[PDB]
Structure 1
Amino acid sequence: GLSDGEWQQVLNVWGKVEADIAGHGQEVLIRLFTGHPETLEKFDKFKHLKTEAEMKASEDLKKHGTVVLTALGGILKKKGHHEAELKPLAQSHATKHKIPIKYLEFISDAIIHVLHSKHPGDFGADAQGAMTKALELFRNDIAAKYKELGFQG
């Protein structure tokens, strides 16, 4: 788990995201889709986006960014006591959306990148360590629910 000081760094960093949740969410998803184009094929409603300009110009992609980060932010604020929130999220992603756990590693990397890009010099080594722990905890709990389902991809 994370210590109290680590959770405090995670939620301090999350305050940066909440100042502009749709814009963080857009950029994180665009980083995901452009770095890993197989991820976009999972999204019937984003599969039409052929260029990064089209991605940036999609209001619906910003709206999804809002939904995705709002879910993540509520989970983070549980400081690891997140079973009731996380289990349905994992089950939805395995059974309906068919999202391999590797995509959660991809978006975790994208969050760290986007945080440095939007907050350069204001996301220090301690804060990156804490946020990395929180994202590992989230994906590892999701991975345990996928194992229950026997879900691979």
Structure 2
Amino acid sequence: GLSDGEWQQVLNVWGKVEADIAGHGQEVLIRLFTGHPETLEKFDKFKHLKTEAEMKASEDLKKHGTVVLTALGGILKKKGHHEAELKPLAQSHATKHKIPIKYLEFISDAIIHVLHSKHPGDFGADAQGAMTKALELFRNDIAAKYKELGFQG
């Protein structure tokens, strides 16, 4: 798991996200969709977004970014004790949304990118290490639930 110090770094970084959750969420999703267009196809309600300008102008995309990062933030604040919060998300993403674990890797990478992009010089090496560990733990616990379900994608 993560040490006390590492969790503290994670939650300090998260304070930066919370100052503009919609903006961070929007940029995370745009990074995901532009870097990996196959991910956009999982969202019937975002398929019409043909260009990045359209993505940037989508108020619904910002709304969804808020929903995603709010869920993630609640999970991070549990500092690993997140079974009850994580289980339903793992199950909805496997059974309903059909999201391969690879796409969770993609979005994890997008979060790290957006943190540097929005806070250049203010996302230190220790903070990146801690946030990476937290996102890996999240992904790994989802992966365990995916294996239970026999879900691949």
TM-score with structure 2 length normalisation? 1.00
Query: Which residues in structure 2 correspond to 1:91-102 (within 5 Å)?
Result: 91-102=91-102
Determine the C-alpha separation between the residues in 2 that align with 1:105 and 1:94.
14
Q: State the shift of 1:68 in Å.
A: 0.2
Q: State the shift of 1:130 in Å.
A: 0.1
Determine the C-alpha separation between the residues in 1 that align with 2:139 and 2:47.
24
Give a deviation string over 1:80-127, Cα, whole Å, max 9, x none: 000000000000000000000000000010000000000000000000
Q: Percent of counterpart pairs with the same letter?
A: 100
Q: State the shift of 1:35 in Å.
A: 0.1
Q: State the shift of 1:75 in Å.
A: 0.1
Determine the C-alpha separation between the residues in 2 that align with 1:34 and 1:78.
31
Query: Which residues in structure 2 correspond to 1:4-153 (within 5 Å)?
Result: 4-153=4-153
- RMSD value, Cα: 0.2
Give a deviation string over 1:28-64, Cα, whole Å, max 9, x none: 0000000000000000000100000000000000000
Q: State the shift of 1:4 in Å.
A: 0.2
Between the two proteins, the alignment pairs up a number of residues equal to 153
Determine the C-alpha separation between the residues in 1 that align with 2:67 and 2:107.
15
TM-score with structure 1 length normalisation? 1.00
Q: State the shift of 1:129 in Å.
A: 0.1
Determine the C-alpha separation between the residues in 1 that align with 2:145 and 2:87.
7
User: 5+ unaligned residues in a row in structure 1: which ranges?
Assistant: none
Determine the C-alpha separation between the residues in 1 that align with 2:129 and 2:25.
21
Q: State the shift of 1:71 in Å.
A: 0.1
Q: State the shift of 1:135 in Å.
A: 0.1
Determine the C-alpha separation between the residues in 2 that align with 1:21 and 1:47.
23
Determine the C-alpha separation between the residues in 1 that align with 2:88 and 2:10.
23
Q: State the shift of 1:15 in Å.
A: 0.2
